Amino acid sequence: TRLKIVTIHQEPFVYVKPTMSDGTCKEEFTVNGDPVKKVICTGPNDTSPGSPRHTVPQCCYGFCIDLLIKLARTMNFTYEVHLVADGKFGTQERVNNSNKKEWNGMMGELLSGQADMIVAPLTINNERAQYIEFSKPFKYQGLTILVKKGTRITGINDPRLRNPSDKFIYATVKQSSVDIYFRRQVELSTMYRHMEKHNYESAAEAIQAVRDNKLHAFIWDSAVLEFEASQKCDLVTTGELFFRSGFGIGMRKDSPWKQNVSLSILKSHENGFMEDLDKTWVRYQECDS
Numbered sequence: 001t002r003l004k005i006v007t008i009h010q011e012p013f014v015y016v017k018p019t020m021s022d023g024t025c026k027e028e029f030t031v032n033g034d035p036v037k038k039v040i041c042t043g044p045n046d047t048s049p050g051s052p053r054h055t056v057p058q059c060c061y062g063f064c065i066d067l068l069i070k071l072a073r074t075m076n077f078t079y080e081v082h083l084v085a086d087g088k089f090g091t092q093e094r095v096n097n098s099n100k101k102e103w104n105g106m107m108g109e110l111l112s113g114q115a116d117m118i119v120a121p122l123t124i125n126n127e128r129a130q131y132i133e134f135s136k137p138f139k140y141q142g143l144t145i146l147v148k149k150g151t152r153i154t155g156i157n158d159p160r161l162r163n164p165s166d167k168f169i170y171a172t173v174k175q176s177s178v179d180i181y182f183r184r185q186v187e188l189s190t191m192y193r194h195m196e197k198h199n200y201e202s203a204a205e206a207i208q209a210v211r212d213n214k215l216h217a218f219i220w221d222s223a224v225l226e227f228e229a230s231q232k233c234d235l236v237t238t239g240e241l242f243f244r245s246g247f248g249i250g251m252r253k254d255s256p257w258k259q260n261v262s263l264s265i266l267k268s269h270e271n272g273f274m275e276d277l278d279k280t281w282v283r284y285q286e287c288d289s
């Protein structure tokens, strides 16, 4: 009767921290002085490779955890939370050198029944929606560009992007959905020729490169980038959001929970719950002084 929830490590939607020796979560508080709600999430012990605990209890919290808690109380279900084993959101890939394709990441865990519900900043798109159901979006999604403050880029149609040169370096994260999407679009091939020269192994490295003036612009999720930029006085996002969609809760097709998850989200938009989440989680009060 208890739902298996899969989520993924992605601040500020889901923070992942160790439990204490007792197996409890450290008591912490929000800017408003409310207790941070924390759940126990088991997941791959990436922090301690070599540990005899391969799958380890950890403390999860953030925007998506508050939202999970709201859903559970509103729809009266119990749950246990785990972090996706391969650390991925989910793409469809050929397996075993055949023509059979399988989803990995959280998409795969949902389809195989290792998860009953995906609660994460999971981007709604047409290909995913062929295989699962999304709720109404709890938050809107798009890409944006991270730059040093002062750098002016209008957005995706900016000439320094559309007509690239070594004078203005931009990039994204290798093997991310952004990377995979860009590399397959005829319309983006000129941009991609530039980007594949500069793509970074991880978002954190790319963000640091922008601070270090080693990368001029980083193309990534706008929620992640706006969160990161708010921490740093010398970092800003710039240009119009682009390639937009929304984040939704994911469930298997014809799930008995789908309508109720959507109604709960619509209620939360209307009553100010979602806006309160945005206030609590999404932006620093001010840049580091």
Ligand SMILES: O=c1[nH]c2ccccc2n2c(S)nnc12
Pocket (backbone or CB within 6 Å): 010, 089, 090, 121, 122, 123, 124, 176, 177, 178, 221, 224
């Ligand atoms: O559903 C997603 N959500 C994502 C949210 C933030 C950053 C990357 C995300 N992502 C990637 S890469 N691939 N799928 C996703």
